[PDB]
Structures are given as C-alpha cells and as structure tokens.
C-alpha cells in the first residue's frame, strides 16, 4: 500500500522529466540562435546609417 501512496510521489518523479523536457530547450537557445540575433547589431547600422 505504500507504493500506491508513493506512486503519487513517483508521479512527481516521472513528470519531473517532462518538466526537464519542457525547460532544457531554453538553455540551448542562447547558443543555437546566435546566427539569428543580428537584429540590434543592425540597429547599430541605423546609427551609422547617417550617410
């Protein structure tokens, strides 16, 4: 009977992987998107776009 009581605790165990699955992607975004962050360094073009 403790297992069924701990299965709800185990439910937190299994779903924590989903939370890890739903959060770890943001970490790789800072490195994989560096080729698409060229927007505000092109804002630096605007200040130097004087001519």
């Amino acid at each position: 009977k403790v297992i069924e009581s701990e299965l709800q605790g185990y439910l937190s165990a299994t779903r924590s992987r989903v939370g890890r699955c739903s959060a770890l992607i943001q970490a790789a975004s800072d490195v994989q998107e560096q080729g698409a962050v060229d927007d505000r360094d092109s804002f630096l073009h605007g200040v130097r776009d004087l001519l």
């Binding site: 092109s42 804002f43 073009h45 605007g46 776009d49 001519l51």
Partner: protein, 48 residues
C-alpha cells in the same frame, strides 16, 4: 566641375530631408524602432 563636386552631396539631400518623414514608415523602424519605441531598451529605466 563644380556641379560634379556637389553631386555626392546632391544625391544625399534628395532623400535625406524626407527620411525624417520616412522615419515613421518601416524604411527606418526596422532598426530605428527604438525612437518609435521611445528608447526600446526599457523606456529608459523605471523598474526593469
């Protein structure tokens, strides 16, 4: 010769004056949105 000297300045002034009125269109706000966003950083600093 003299008119040729002004040509680089002449070609500039053709759209330079209108680009203030062109600032509000997307011809400038793709970078210059900060002005329309009023210091797009965070509107200066209040809390962020």
């Amino acid at each position: 010769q003299g008119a040729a000297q002004n040509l680089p300045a002449d070609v500039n002034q053709l759209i330079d004056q209108l680009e203030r009125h062109c600032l509000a269109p997307d011809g400038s706000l793709v970078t210059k949105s900060v002005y329309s966003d009023l210091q797009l950083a965070r509107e200066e600093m209040s809390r962020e």
